[PDB]
Design a protein around this ligand. Structure first.
Ligand SMILES: COc1ccc([C@H](N)c2ccccc2)cc1
Ligand SMILES: COc1ccc([C@H](N)c2ccccc2)cc1
Ligand SMILES: [Zn+2]
Ligand SMILES: [Zn+2]
Ligand SMILES: [Zn+2]
Ligand SMILES: [Zn+2]
Lengths: 75, 68
């Protein structure tokens, strides 16, 4: 039904929000510290000197294990 | 249709996976450091000395700003 189409759209948008803002391909699994922005996969977070969201210096990257993780890289 | 029921269940499960595993009421927004398990809201994470997933000592809690 039309309701099925609406639900499919919501599901798609929620899944896309869990993907890396730089490569758009891998799941987010890294946090920039100390600011806390958690928007990249491990590969894209590794070379950034400053946070792509707030410009704060990246002192280090903390790996995050999230319950929503499903990709073969996070399992 | 039956697919409306299936998608509603999938969406509910994905939303529930983003809720704190201790209080079941607030969104996850905290990481236990250094282990990295990100399974609690800030209120439950502040009250745990050990990670509820792996039992590693919590050295500190890092707030996470997620796009969701
Ligand atoms: C499959 O389509 C997507 C893949 C990844 C994104 C990602 N969350 C994003 C956030 C901000 C800026 C650009 C990408 C979005 C859509
Ligand atoms: C129906 O409301 C819920 C709220 C939160 C959870 C949560 N993800 C959880 C994970 C593991 C253990 C216990 C709770 C699940 C359902
Ligand atoms: Zn990436
Ligand atoms: Zn930042
Ligand atoms: Zn909680
Ligand atoms: Zn842990």
């Amino acid at each position: 039904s039309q309701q099925t189409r609406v639900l499919q759209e919501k599901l798609r948008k929620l899944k896309e929000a869990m993907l890396c803002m730089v490569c758009c391909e891998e799941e987010i699994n890294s946090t920039f510290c100390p600011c806390g922005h958690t928007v990249c996969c491990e590969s894209c977070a590794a070379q950034l000197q400053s946070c792509p969201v707030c410009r704060s210096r990246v002192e280090h990257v903390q790996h995050v294990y999230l319950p929503t993780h499903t990709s073969l890289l996070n399992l």
